[PDB]
């Protein structure tokens, strides 16, 4: 049975955690297809979402999904993965994979000074 | 034994006396000037010299850790008594 | 215990005082000894923190167990040297038994 | 001083009618405690 | 005429006839000292400066070693730190504990090297020596109990002041420094003997006990009243002049004062 | 975003909020400090310090404490470069006065020089 | 120091043993005139192997390592 | 809308706070708090002094939880200096820091009850607080501001026969905690007062910088004692309290469960006390004893330099967030290599809480907002600095 | 150097004119509502002389930071977070001005 | 027993995480320092501070949701004197991170309100105490200073004792302001010992 109390407050429980997690993991995989291959956020984000989605299609139990996601609870990793989806769209807007925009002065990061 | 000023007030052991043409005695009218009667200059010649049978001695001020740290003072000078630099009590060589 | 004001003018108890309350400008006593001519704590500054009673190498300043010294004007909480000396002369029988029962801890 | 009350109650003091030229029959303040008894009255020690 | 000198892996090219003190001063690491003033003669008399010279089994005195060829001076090594903490324990064995009586609270050059380069808890439990006080003059107060016999005052008085009066009498811990006959050591350049002395054994009688150097504010000026025009550190405490000290200047001053 | 191309000397008087007399009637000293002459250590003198001109410090008429007219007299400041210190003094707008860094010179000091045959460097004591 | 009727009245009001565990300290205070306690020394009050360069906690730190960039 | 100033002088603002409220009706629309009425410049004033002179600020910043903040500051200074405390002193740290936890939670439950209007545990808990301040005065000699935790372990030892009096306090404290839990949790007035009022989501409780008892009222498990092991808190075994409905009532019962759990850890602190020393055996971060000082020499040298200059502290930055019972307390010390700190930010727990009070006080009224400042437990010295 | 709002001086001068317009609009409400012991004319002259106090700066980022500091003073003046004590310490009703000639500065102190 | 014991497994795994973030953000990250105290000091560029903190909050492998601390440390040697820190703290990974950027007092930093509403008050406190513009803040209203306090006080060029000092008068019956002259001067102590303290932290000439 699904949990009545979610273990939190405000973060409401959902009825289809496998469906929302597979659907939003395929959405955050589809967002990184417009990322460049030169960007290594694409490779490491595709690695962590591919390994976690492989755990999702490996296990059908909700508490085993919590134990192999290792993110506390399933609604917490749904919330944090939708923040990761918004981060991937925002970093598509920002493009951080290019090199450093300005070198600092050489006395800026020296301690003690 | 508190000495008095020419104005009429008391003089501390630091030698401080307010002069006659100073306004700073105007907090001294109808309120008493606090002066300790036991001068530390006068209360050091009352106790006699302590006899030392060695060439050096080490005082503590009485009480061990209550008093002062244990300074070894030299007693080779016989014409002047070797004063402890922490207290001020005087030591005299016995021979 | 035989006369002789214990304050040996080290100028270290205002380097520990976080109020910056203590001005202890000294001179020699014209005796060969070493005492103070100017002591000032400030009771209005004076955080009552116990640092100067633990800094003091001869335990000259102490913090005697009083609280009945609430005054009406600001001038009477500006303890210079003679008020401090007859304060310790007033409470010397009260302080020294507490120091004798307390000096194993410090 | 007695024993069967709580702490702070069990050691106490009735003050003088006057001392040092001030009549303390009605105006009674806690600064007239002698210093040899100020250690005893605040229970810093057990012996009188 | 340059020598490749390693100071913990540095590559300092230095001229021959130098000290390991100067070879470390060109790096920035400062070897701890009591006998060696910079502008006095070399005489190893305190043995604080011990550093090892890359794997030779005796640690060497860094005052009087000319660096020869490729010697790696290990300043922060195990045997050098053991030698520094040991010699500070040797200095603080027979020192008397007059540090609140002393004029040099923060101007003590031995409290700082004990604080950064010494041990924590002394194993001295036996009994200190004590030295008869002298009558050197109305300007140089000498409490010679706490003298470490480092001979920094006798070399200045024998070489630059030129007086030949302050020399050491005796041997062991009975060896005391000063005039043997009760002689007034009082000439020009006698107040430089006060600031040369890294211990507060001998200091001033006008500035006897009046202040303490962390409380004072040190602001600089030129001299008047003798026409050398020397550089003056005035130490001010609550708007009152407490010490006049020589600011180091290699022209005019050369660290001394009248 | 576009970079703006201006070239003026910098003033942060209105940002720092100082009164006008504390800029126009004050001068500032940028200096490596002197070595304390009873010490033989150099660690005080590696930092370029900033101090102000000392104003009037009188005695408090009740006690005799140092009463200062100026709040800026308590401040000392620490840098590590003279041109960065002069950039800070030029942006704060005070009247600078810089003393250059004075170093020890390398002197050929030897122990065997102190015991020489024909020279005058033989020390009479030991 | 209450009587039995008011003690049983507040035990009826509570259900707890307030007489056994009062909130006011009667005689559970230790005696304030005490023997002087000799405080123990620490682990490094030893005259042998008292070298500070082995126990030196304030010199064992390193300036922080820049791992990747510049 | 009236632009009402709530004012410092109204006693449910804890003496300090100017809230302004642009309120339409008594349904308050927005509440804009201008803290800064107690701004003392502690972070400016810490820099110009030594480290041991910078110690008794943290007696006074969180002034209803004192020894927790000097535990925080001295654990930051000891992590800067790489000095482990002695373990007897570490058990003294956790014992008096949990006396300080009982202190701050007594003030929290008390000022929550006074702000709602229950004036009864403003005296009933304060009698046992006077019993605890006897222990504070027994160890240090000041009732509030100890400065007893130093860097390099605590300052002095305990007076003799103290631990029997701590045990006789702790056996009697449990009935008074259960008595206040009888009087104020199962009742009808507080149940009508504290249900579905001031609910924060866990997303807002993470994104608003809420920490400690706000996070435990929101139900996430983020004590800074078992998740991050500091001092000797890893040795003791406690249950953590968590909220369920997320309201102010969940903060009230998590404070009640924190009372009982801190009393449980105080019981095992008395049971598992080790013998040992009180300061570290290093004369350059700890001042030596007077008996070895009066005879030995390097003890007086290091006494002189540690009490005038202080500790020469190696450079770098640290920030050690510990569990204050208000929440996150940690100090961001930077050191220039001298004996003065260069700067520190002192982490107030309630700074981000009273930043986020504008979210949780919407849709409520004035008695609900004085109930939520009593719930959130804002005292203002650590916040205004 | 990076800008703040203004890529030149005259646009920031227009922002200064906008802030002066809003301050001149705001100040009779904070004369009438504040129960203040002044008129509106010397208050407006105080606003004008505080604008002329920092008139010498031609730097656009410095005058943009003066624009946000004047906006915070405007935000604390439109709403009444400032009171009748805080709002008119600018007039210096109690502090005597320091004299500018040499003779009175000679007589007053070592300056 | 005197020295704190060192656990280097946290040092190498947080150094691997620091190399990870320094590789994945090469545009903004200027360096990453790892101390001996198992924490990370990622020093970045102030034009792009919001990609750095949105990456540190929203990513599943960084996951620093809770901001904790935000001030400057003002070092006047540097050309950009303010050194703005962002101390953040993961609930789930039980780890800490520090983000250090720089600031001049003329060059602004774009604010981080849109990623954390914890910094609705911290950036206002920074605008009081040091005085940097924060771009697109909801309100950057002054908080800790006085209402009308000219001068950011936590910079090194502001004094300890301030410039104004309040005083009641009976001429006007207000708590008026005067330029401060002290009853007692704060005695500046020379607490820097003149001998060399740490040989590892030695400045090259
Ligand atoms: C009763 C309550 C009272 C409350 C009272 C409150 C008084 C304080 C109000 C807030 C402060 C105020 O914003 C300060 C500011 O705007 S400052 C900078 C002005 N902008 C410039 O300086 C740029 C260059 N602009 C020019 O040069 C012009 O042409 C000028 C008109 C200045 C003539 O200059 P010249 O030619 O003279
Ligand atoms: S009170 Fe103590 S520490 Fe202070 S000067 Fe006097 S003897 Fe020295
Ligand atoms: S008790 Fe008072 S005088 Fe003594 S150190 Fe503390 S604040 Fe200063
Ligand atoms: S010179 Fe000797 S007596 Fe004076 S402070 Fe230094 S160690 Fe102490
Ligand atoms: S008096 Fe001073 S300079 Fe001379 S030998 Fe003794 S410690 Fe050295
Ligand atoms: S410093 Fe070299 S022996 Fe004295
Ligand atoms: Zn003696």
PDB file of N, CA, C and O and ligand atoms in Angstrom, chain B residues 58-62 68-71 83-89 91, ligand 7:
ATOM      1  N   UNK B  58      64.889  31.588  48.140  1.00  0.00           N
ATOM      2  CA  UNK B  58      63.728  31.633  47.263  1.00  0.00           C
ATOM      3  C   UNK B  58      62.477  31.793  48.110  1.00  0.00           C
ATOM      4  O   UNK B  58      62.169  30.921  48.927  1.00  0.00           O
ATOM      5  N   UNK B  59      61.761  32.895  47.917  1.00  0.00           N
ATOM      6  CA  UNK B  59      60.537  33.146  48.661  1.00  0.00           C
ATOM      7  C   UNK B  59      59.326  32.719  47.842  1.00  0.00           C
ATOM      8  O   UNK B  59      59.420  32.404  46.656  1.00  0.00           O
ATOM      9  N   UNK B  60      58.172  32.720  48.500  1.00  0.00           N
ATOM     10  CA  UNK B  60      56.907  32.442  47.845  1.00  0.00           C
ATOM     11  C   UNK B  60      55.811  33.429  48.207  1.00  0.00           C
ATOM     12  O   UNK B  60      54.747  33.393  47.583  1.00  0.00           O
ATOM     13  N   UNK B  61      56.036  34.308  49.184  1.00  0.00           N
ATOM     14  CA  UNK B  61      55.017  35.221  49.654  1.00  0.00           C
ATOM     15  C   UNK B  61      54.069  34.647  50.680  1.00  0.00           C
ATOM     16  O   UNK B  61      53.178  35.368  51.145  1.00  0.00           O
ATOM     17  N   UNK B  62      54.232  33.380  51.053  1.00  0.00           N
ATOM     18  CA  UNK B  62      53.339  32.739  51.996  1.00  0.00           C
ATOM     19  C   UNK B  62      52.164  32.064  51.320  1.00  0.00           C
ATOM     20  O   UNK B  62      51.393  32.714  50.606  1.00  0.00           O
ATOM     21  N   UNK B  68      53.392  34.393  45.385  1.00  0.00           N
ATOM     22  CA  UNK B  68      54.048  34.727  44.138  1.00  0.00           C
ATOM     23  C   UNK B  68      54.854  33.540  43.616  1.00  0.00           C
ATOM     24  O   UNK B  68      55.055  32.560  44.340  1.00  0.00           O
ATOM     25  N   UNK B  69      55.272  33.558  42.342  1.00  0.00           N
ATOM     26  CA  UNK B  69      56.231  32.551  41.869  1.00  0.00           C
ATOM     27  C   UNK B  69      57.599  32.644  42.535  1.00  0.00           C
ATOM     28  O   UNK B  69      58.023  33.699  43.012  1.00  0.00           O
ATOM     29  N   UNK B  70      58.288  31.501  42.551  1.00  0.00           N
ATOM     30  CA  UNK B  70      59.386  31.234  43.483  1.00  0.00           C
ATOM     31  C   UNK B  70      60.704  31.738  42.897  1.00  0.00           C
ATOM     32  O   UNK B  70      61.499  30.992  42.321  1.00  0.00           O
ATOM     33  N   UNK B  71      60.952  33.032  43.082  1.00  0.00           N
ATOM     34  CA  UNK B  71      62.143  33.679  42.535  1.00  0.00           C
ATOM     35  C   UNK B  71      63.326  33.450  43.463  1.00  0.00           C
ATOM     36  O   UNK B  71      63.278  33.797  44.649  1.00  0.00           O
ATOM     37  N   UNK B  83      66.326  42.387  48.388  1.00  0.00           N
ATOM     38  CA  UNK B  83      64.876  42.482  48.361  1.00  0.00           C
ATOM     39  C   UNK B  83      64.299  41.512  47.343  1.00  0.00           C
ATOM     40  O   UNK B  83      64.844  41.339  46.249  1.00  0.00           O
ATOM     41  N   UNK B  84      63.200  40.865  47.718  1.00  0.00           N
ATOM     42  CA  UNK B  84      62.432  40.075  46.768  1.00  0.00           C
ATOM     43  C   UNK B  84      61.718  41.013  45.805  1.00  0.00           C
ATOM     44  O   UNK B  84      61.055  41.962  46.232  1.00  0.00           O
ATOM     45  N   UNK B  85      61.878  40.766  44.504  1.00  0.00           N
ATOM     46  CA  UNK B  85      61.298  41.648  43.505  1.00  0.00           C
ATOM     47  C   UNK B  85      59.796  41.527  43.376  1.00  0.00           C
ATOM     48  O   UNK B  85      59.144  42.467  42.910  1.00  0.00           O
ATOM     49  N   UNK B  86      59.235  40.391  43.784  1.00  0.00           N
ATOM     50  CA  UNK B  86      57.791  40.207  43.753  1.00  0.00           C
ATOM     51  C   UNK B  86      57.126  40.858  44.958  1.00  0.00           C
ATOM     52  O   UNK B  86      56.240  41.705  44.809  1.00  0.00           O
ATOM     53  N   UNK B  87      57.543  40.476  46.167  1.00  0.00           N
ATOM     54  CA  UNK B  87      56.937  41.059  47.363  1.00  0.00           C
ATOM     55  C   UNK B  87      57.549  42.419  47.674  1.00  0.00           C
ATOM     56  O   UNK B  87      56.905  43.458  47.510  1.00  0.00           O
ATOM     57  N   UNK B  88      58.823  42.428  48.043  1.00  0.00           N
ATOM     58  CA  UNK B  88      59.445  43.580  48.666  1.00  0.00           C
ATOM     59  C   UNK B  88      59.944  43.328  50.072  1.00  0.00           C
ATOM     60  O   UNK B  88      60.578  44.222  50.653  1.00  0.00           O
ATOM     61  N   UNK B  89      59.683  42.157  50.650  1.00  0.00           N
ATOM     62  CA  UNK B  89      60.260  41.820  51.943  1.00  0.00           C
ATOM     63  C   UNK B  89      61.741  41.497  51.778  1.00  0.00           C
ATOM     64  O   UNK B  89      62.181  40.996  50.740  1.00  0.00           O
ATOM     65  N   UNK B  91      65.736  40.240  52.794  1.00  0.00           N
ATOM     66  CA  UNK B  91      66.502  39.104  53.279  1.00  0.00           C
ATOM     67  C   UNK B  91      67.916  39.557  53.613  1.00  0.00           C
ATOM     68  O   UNK B  91      68.517  40.343  52.876  1.00  0.00           O
TER      69      UNK B  91
HETATM   70 ZN1  LIG K   7      58.721  37.259  47.888  1.00  0.00          ZN
END
